[PDB]
Design a protein around this motif. Structure first.
Motif, PDB file in Angstrom:
ATOM      1  N   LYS A 294       2.498  11.718  -4.445  1.00 23.45           N
ATOM      2  CA  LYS A 294       3.471  12.782  -4.219  1.00 23.45           C
ATOM      3  C   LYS A 294       4.932  12.337  -4.334  1.00 23.45           C
ATOM      4  O   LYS A 294       5.840  13.091  -3.979  1.00 23.45           O
ATOM      5  CB  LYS A 294       3.244  13.405  -2.847  1.00 23.45           C
ATOM      6  N   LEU A 295       5.163  11.118  -4.811  1.00 23.98           N
ATOM      7  CA  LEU A 295       6.503  10.711  -5.221  1.00 23.98           C
ATOM      8  C   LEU A 295       6.850  11.296  -6.594  1.00 23.98           C
ATOM      9  O   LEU A 295       8.024  11.447  -6.913  1.00 23.98           O
ATOM     10  CB  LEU A 295       6.634   9.184  -5.261  1.00 23.98           C
TER      11      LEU A 295
ATOM     12  N   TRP B  90       3.797  11.246   1.595  1.00 20.96           N
ATOM     13  CA  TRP B  90       3.884  10.296   0.480  1.00 20.96           C
ATOM     14  C   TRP B  90       3.670   8.851   0.922  1.00 20.96           C
ATOM     15  O   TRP B  90       3.212   8.007   0.139  1.00 20.96           O
ATOM     16  CB  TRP B  90       5.239  10.421  -0.242  1.00 20.96           C
TER      17      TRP B  90
ATOM     18  N   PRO C   1       4.145   5.440  -8.124  1.00 22.21           N
ATOM     19  CA  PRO C   1       2.861   5.682  -7.449  1.00 22.21           C
ATOM     20  C   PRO C   1       1.710   4.752  -7.818  1.00 22.21           C
ATOM     21  O   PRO C   1       0.965   4.333  -6.932  1.00 22.21           O
ATOM     22  CB  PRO C   1       2.523   7.104  -7.869  1.00 22.21           C
TER      23      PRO C   1
ATOM     24  N   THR D   3       0.871   8.324  -1.842  1.00 25.68           N
ATOM     25  CA  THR D   3       2.067   8.007  -2.636  1.00 25.68           C
ATOM     26  C   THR D   3       2.160   8.672  -4.026  1.00 25.68           C
ATOM     27  O   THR D   3       3.204   8.593  -4.678  1.00 25.68           O
ATOM     28  CB  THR D   3       2.219   6.469  -2.766  1.00 25.68           C
TER      29      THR D   3
END
Ligand SMILES: C[C@H]1O[C@H](O[C@H]2[C@H](O)[C@@H](O)[C@@H](O[C@H]3[C@H](O)[C@@H](O)[C@@H](O)O[C@@H]3CO)O[C@@H]2CO)[C@H](O)[C@@H](O)[C@@H]1N[C@H]1C=C(CO)[C@@H](O)[C@H](O)[C@H]1O
Ligand SMILES: C[C@H]1O[C@H](O[C@H]2[C@H](O)[C@@H](O)[C@@H](O[C@H]3[C@H](O)[C@@H](O)[C@@H](O)O[C@@H]3CO)O[C@@H]2CO)[C@H](O)[C@@H](O)[C@@H]1N[C@H]1C=C(CO)[C@@H](O)[C@H](O)[C@H]1O
Ligand SMILES: *Cc1c(COP(=O)(O)O)cnc(C)c1O
Ligand SMILES: *Cc1c(COP(=O)(O)O)cnc(C)c1O
Ligand SMILES: OC[C@H]1O[C@H](O)[C@H](O)[C@@H](O)[C@@H]1O
Ligand SMILES: OC[C@H]1O[C@H](O)[C@H](O)[C@@H](O)[C@@H]1O
Lengths: 843, 843
Positions: free
Chosen positions: B522-523, B516, B819, B520
């Protein structure tokens, strides 16, 4: 440590302590990298020397000077480490040439003349002989000036030696000391004096390691750079638009390190010149005090101070050390006056470099009283003691005698006497014991040095005697044991071994070792080989080979083309009426005139071919000295392009004379000139350099020449002119109209006034050799008087040069007679007879 | 590469690239050594990146800004190299603590606010994503100012970040470019223009490598330092005594890099501000031009220039790039106007950060005409073309229309029209087409940027629309395809990963990777875990642990003692009436008053305990902003030492807010305030930082808040106050006496006027919220209007904080919604939609 590894470390420093783009390729870039690779060795050795000195806590000596003519560090660092062969090869690998790389290094602009070069030579010898000793100086940005020669004479350009930073120094950010200007004194609760207020700057340390030859001992030159903390920058001033005001605080601090010997014909220039000195003294003493304390630790006794510390004031510039040391001991450490004074008198010592008693530093009391009021209080006290000691040693009974003793020795001239002494002159008080506003109130620094030091020394046998007899007579009467002599010297590593490698090979062959570099007494083994034909052949070849590097220099710097198959006649020193460059050039002009009134067959019969080389800087403001460099250049333009002369005679003024120039010039020199008016030069270090390289001297009986003549032999030295005692009389003779010059001297003056050397005519210059009385006229420096003696002495030089067997015989005897003039034995004498320090060898 | 070797290289740099005495021992000394050891890695990688970019010769992007808020480099360098664990241990070996060492690094004073921090974040993302891109800036010595808080309010001190040198830069001595000021233009033999005379300085390059995260790509920030060569130092001036005069030339050059945004209420300040810009533009373009040429080599075609170069002008400060590029192409390279202009229009682009059309840079023509006369000639030509294009696209037929189009778009306002356009306004000529001396002759830089760039962009969806509709409307009509949007972002490596390691561990656990950090997006996998009890427990622990480092900061910087078990309510941004610190403090003052008129049992029932933290710098000259920091400090003194309040409420003003302060503050923050008057903020980057760390936002519908609210969800954002469209009307309503404030607002004003907060009374400050009309009065920024809405919105914040299940749920959704605000995707958009560059991965 082999060459393959050094080549890596050079590359490493180029890429990992970089100053340029990576793809950029410069001899200069190679220099900064090579400098840093050598420096790694100096750091290791410096830290080892530093650490072991702390362990042993032996007495350390400290040499303060306003000048350090350090010169290029690269060739001498590598030499002293004995990595000179392998660095050369390491640089071949990288596509470079050591000689070519070395010549990219700028000369540090940290000095000017003899005073500074002596100091630097002294630091080499101190390290080489394992003496624990530092130099303290100031870190000048622009130095004195870079000399350029135009068609107008000399011009001055500020130096650029720090523009990319000095690879040879280490900034010590933890080492910062506060220094105070102006302010006032007040007496606090605890009976003690306190100096408050005023202006405050900080001196930061920049260390320059001094590696010794064939030893790990690496001593130090600590250089102060002045500044103020960023917070003193005035944003209000800046944002309001007044950008100079915003920067004013920084300028005040920073300018203390801008220029060497700043012009002082202005009250603001005198104040700066004075701040420069106090800064050097204060910062340095605070540092020395700090070292003594940290080493002593718990068992701290100030009575031990002078058995652990020796300060040496080079000339009168560092005089303020005396009252400054008193200041710190009493005000800061809480000592009594007598306890402080006893320590001071035994810590400090003075070396004098002037023969004239009116070339000694004087300061206005008012200016000093304003800038350093606490120091004047202290000086006042010192002068009162001094006078009560004169009272004890002389008078009351004979008063007019006492009157004379008090004038001679007073530190504060034209000041009200203290009530104690003043008593003795009542009738009320005699005019003598009162301030007379008709004249200034002056502080005589030389006298304060003599009062404050345990030892006072000159720099030549003759000069040290003049110091005792003329300059400080009543002081010598009072304290005869103070007065000493320490004849100067120069390091044989920089001035033979590394500047003259070709000669150095020849020396080590015939003596049977290279140990002479260190133990220079073993040059005397050359006396016996003076007549050997083979030695003479190698010796002439070398001299000739060294002259070819000067041909490159002259070609490159001036444009003139000269043949190395002439006599290399060099006068290279500061331009001054008293050094008498004018006497030399007028002598050349005489020979030129003779050549022109003579057949082309006879020109060859009468004169040996010469290349007469001048060099040196004229003080910018000195009008007549600057006219002299102008005149010389004009002679060169006329002489060098004259078809009738050809290669029989050339005159060249090499610009920007400095350590690097001397290093090329000196080994190539066959005749050097040291022709100052007799009794005007105290020593002279270049004299000693020239003789070491087999160069013959023409000179007067003056300064270092006198001892050089003794050592090399009177038969091997071209002496001329009036002796020192004859002088005062010849001038008084002139004043009463009794001096009639040689017809050949009037001939040259008229031949110069003829206009043959350009559109300048120089009626003004020749005018300085005429009349009987007056400032800048009346031939004060006896050019006309010594002239006939001099040009006739040059005929003897020609005739000796004709027999290259004789010339080279004498050349070899000069090298063989030079051992006495190595700074090594000078240092021993200082170490033993004054400082009382011993060598410290790390295991 | 293990920790045992790093420990050696740290030691090595301490001893062999030293800045201090060897025996000296400092956390600071450890820092400079540690900095240099990391730097070895950056050099290797920088040289590799530099070399491979030359091979591939791909289009390179260049980001020009007057600001770079770089922040401390150590923690982020080590982080991006992933040696963060081993450096920590390497420092344990040497008796040090990474955290403790890191905190000795000074913040580079190379920027100030958002403009600069954006730029810096943009450089991280460019490197991390392997884009070939440099930043060009200037190397400020003292920066803007170091803020100190006394009992008088704020004071300003010049910064000291360069006092010991910057270990994070490399001086490139081969990279020096000449820059010219004043002078005049003349037409030489070859029909071509030549700019001669004037004043000449040199810009030297100081490179700061920008390492990317998990990549070898190390891009560059090239920083210009202005100077002049030592030879321009006037020795004559210096020796005569005038030491400032001698230094004048150096001051002129050097001051260009002294202060960021120098005060310009003086003609000399405007000239400096203008020289700063031209220097940045000229030096940088000359360097870019040089790189294009060396790479192209033999096959050199200038038509390729915009396919190999992209310049990005950040705000209007670098506008001069436009005419400067034209200058070099025509005058230096010999291109025609159209050939040069076509290349220029396609090379340059403009990013605008202002929502107000009267906050756009204007310069006096006279001043510019004097300093850069050749650039005015060029601007003149550009303005004439621009107007002939407006003529083509509109008029002759409708003239009053054309009149309006010409006002809006002209670059030179209040100037005689060119004869071409002037024709169209005859009756003789209309007043409009003549210079009216009643007003100044002005150069409008924003308009010149729009004319000269191929793309124009805003920094938020709403703002980019305002830019099209209000600010540059007639331009949008003319060239709609120019206009774009690029919503800002911030790097998640500095603003989550490295400033908030505790949270970062929690994130990587539950998402199941640390990927992440780079990707990012994948936050968003955190949305589903928002209600999970265990996550919530770790997440609250972390926030609490991060608040304890702020307790140390407050204790240390202000002296106040605060409990971490309160709500950490933070407003941290530049002090300005429009940002409305005043609105926040008056809201706190309201709650204080309520507490005081309430029983000690009820104080607890009604209000949650808070620590309200303010920070930021007031423009020195801004009288009212400085009174506001003063007022806040006074409230703190009163509130913090009140026995009735205790730990229920504390107010703290943290001094000297900067990147390092934000790094400690932000991760500890639970509520942050972004309460600017609606439609006054263009974006805001701190907004995005706070949400990433799980901090909740209270704010108006303004700038970045609008998109942040969309992403994190309206339920998880505390919205209040008037919307942007309502504003102009509320002010006109005020002007005609129709606004009647809430009784609670008059209550606070009187309660402040009561004198309860010290001896100051502040009748003047409250006076700025009164009356109906006038400069600095009349509550222009709607503090009174939004007040009731605001304090009621704070009651909702209290009530949400009561349920730490809900609070932490919303906290997690803010991180999960962040994100979009990573500078990574911002960069992609710039790279694809404007610069048209691609990533370059070395094998
Ligand atoms: C320092 C200075 O020394 C030399 O000056 C001497 C004069 O040449 C003499 O004429 C003599 O002055 C006497 C008067 O002429 C006489 O009428 C009577 O009043 O007694 C006077 C005693 O002084 O003595 C002078 C000093 O002993 C030399 O000529 C001169 O070049 C020297 N100064 C130069 C040095 C610098 C700094 O490097 C420059 O600033 C000066 O301008 C130079 O002139
Ligand atoms: C740049 C400036 O913006 C703000 O100023 C505005 C005024 O507050 C308004 O009153 C309004 O001025 C109008 C007159 O009052 C009205 O009688 C009529 O003549 O129209 C005028 C239109 O301007 O509009 C102003 C600007 O739109 C704000 O109050 C002020 O704080 C701002 N300037 C500050 C910034 C700096 C630099 O950081 C300081 O140098 C200034 O001193 C500050 O005041
Ligand atoms: C040795 C030296 C001097 C000193 O020569 P003097 O004969 O004392 O004038 C001056 N300058 C340089 C560069 C030197 O090496
Ligand atoms: C991110 C940042 C800013 C910008 O905050 P705004 O909300 O745009 O005012 C200012 N200063 C510092 C130190 C920052 O890190
Ligand atoms: O010029 C004569 C010189 O002799 C010696 O070098 C002295 O050390 C120096 O002070 C003096 O300048
Ligand atoms: O304060 C609002 C800020 O928004 C963004 O950070 C912009 O990039 C900056 O220019 C502006 O200052």
């Amino acid at each position: 440590i082999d060459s393959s590894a050094i080549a890596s470390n050079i590359q490493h420093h180029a890429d990992f302590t970089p100053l340029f783009s990576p793809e950029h390729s410069s001899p200069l870039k190679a220099y900064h990298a090579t400098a840093k690779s050598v420096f790694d060795s100096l750091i290791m050795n410096w830290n080892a020397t530093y650490d072991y000195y702390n362990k042993v806590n032996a007495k350390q000596a400290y040499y303060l000077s306003m000048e350090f003519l350090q010169g290029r560090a690269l060739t001498n660092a590598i030499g002293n480490l004995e990595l000179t062969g392998q660095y050369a090869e390491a640089l071949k690998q990288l596509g470079h040439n050591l000689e070519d790389v070395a010549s990219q290094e700028p000369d540090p602009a940290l000095g000017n003349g003899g005073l500074g070069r002596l100091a630097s030579c002294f630091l080499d010898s101190l390290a080489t002989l394992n003496y624990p000793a530092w130099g303290y100086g100031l870190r000048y940005r622009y130095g004195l000036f870079k000399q350029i020669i135009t068609k107008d004479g000399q011009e001055e350009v500020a130096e650029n030696w720090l523009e990319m930073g000095n690879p040879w120094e280490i900034v010590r950010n933890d080492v910062s000391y506060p220094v105070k200007f102006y302010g006032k004194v007040v007496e606090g609760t605890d009976g003690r004096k306190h100096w408050i207020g005023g202006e405050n700057i900080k001196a930061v340390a920049h260390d320059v390691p001094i590696p010794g030859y064939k030893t790990k001992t690496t001593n130090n030159l600590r250089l102060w750079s002045t500044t103020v903390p960023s917070q003193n920058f005035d944003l209000g001033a800046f944002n309001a638009g007044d950008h100079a005001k915003a920067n004013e605080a920084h300028l005040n601090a920073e300018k203390i390190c801008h220029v060497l010997y700043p012009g002082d014909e202005s009250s603001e220039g005198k104040i700066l010149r004075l701040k420069q000195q106090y800064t050097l003294c204060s910062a340095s003493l605070q540092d020395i005090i700090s070292r003594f304390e940290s080493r002593a630790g718990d068992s701290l006794n100030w009575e031990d101070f002078p058995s652990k510390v020796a300060v040496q004031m080079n000339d009168t510039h560092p005089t303020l050390c005396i009252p400054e040391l008193m200041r710190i001991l009493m005000d800061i450490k809480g000592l009594s006056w007598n306890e402080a004074w006893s320590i001071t008198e035994r810590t400090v010592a003075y070396t004098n470099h002037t023969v004239l008693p009116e070339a000694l530093e004087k300061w206005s009391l008012d200016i000093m009283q304003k800038l350093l009021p606490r120091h004047v209080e202290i000086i006042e006290t010192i002068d009162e003691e001094l006078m009560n000691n004169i009272v004890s040693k002389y008078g009351t009974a004979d008063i007019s005698l006492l009157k004379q003793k008090l004038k001679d020795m007073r530190i504060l001239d034209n000041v009200d006497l203290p009530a104690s002494v003043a008593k003795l002159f009542i009738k009320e008080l005699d005019p003598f014991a009162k301030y007379d506003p008709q004249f200034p109130r002056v502080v005589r620094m030389a006298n304060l040095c003599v009062v404050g030091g345990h030892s006072v020394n000159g720099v030549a046998e003759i000069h040290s005697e003049i110091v005792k007899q003329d300059v400080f007579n009543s002081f010598y009467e009072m304290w005869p044991t103070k007065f000493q002599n320490k004849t100067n010297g120069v390091t044989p590593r920089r001035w033979i071994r590394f500047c003259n490698p070709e000669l150095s090979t020849i020396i080590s062959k015939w003596i049977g070792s290279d140990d002479w570099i260190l133990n220079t007494d073993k040059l005397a083994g050359l006396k016996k080989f003076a007549d050997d034909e083979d030695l003479q052949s190698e010796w002439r070849t070398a001299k000739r080979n060294n002259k070819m590097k000067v041909v490159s220099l002259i070609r490159d710097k001036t444009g003139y083309i000269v043949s190395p198959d002439a006599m290399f006649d060099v006068q290279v020193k500061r331009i001054h009426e008293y050094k008498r460059q004018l006497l030399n050039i007028l002598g050349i002009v005489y020979r030129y005139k003779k050549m022109k009134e003579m057949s082309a067959k006879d020109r060859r019969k009468s004169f040996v071919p010469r290349v007469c080389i001048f060099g040196g800087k004229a003080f910018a403001t000195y009008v007549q000295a600057k006219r002299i460099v102008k005149f010389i250049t004009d002679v060169a333009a006329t002489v060098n392009y004259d078809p009738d002369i050809g290669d029989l005679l050339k005159v060249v003024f090499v610009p920007d004379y400095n350590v690097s120039v001397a290093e090329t010039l000196i080994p190539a020199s066959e005749l050097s000139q040291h022709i100052s008016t007799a009794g005007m030069e105290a020593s002279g270090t270049s004299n000693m350099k020239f003789a070491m390289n087999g160069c013959l001297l023409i000179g007067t009986l003056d300064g270092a020449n006198v001892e050089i003549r003794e050592e090399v032999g009177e038969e091997n030295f071209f002496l001329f002119g009036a002796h020192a005692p004859e002088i005062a009389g010849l001038r008084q003779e002139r004043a009463e109209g009794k001096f009639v010059p040689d017809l050949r001297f009037e001939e040259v003056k008229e031949y110069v006034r003829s206009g043959v050397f350009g559109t300048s005519n120089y009626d003004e210059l020749m005018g300085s050799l005429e009349g009987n009385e007056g400032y800048g006229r009346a031939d004060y420096f006896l050019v006309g008087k010594d002239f006939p003696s001099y040009i006739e002495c040059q005929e003897k030089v020609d005739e000796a040069y004709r027999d290259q067997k004789l010339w080279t015989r004498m050349s070899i005897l000069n090298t063989a007679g030079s051992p006495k003039f190595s700074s090594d034995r000078t240092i021993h004498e200082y170490a033993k007879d004054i400082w009382d320090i011993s060598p410290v060898i790390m295991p």
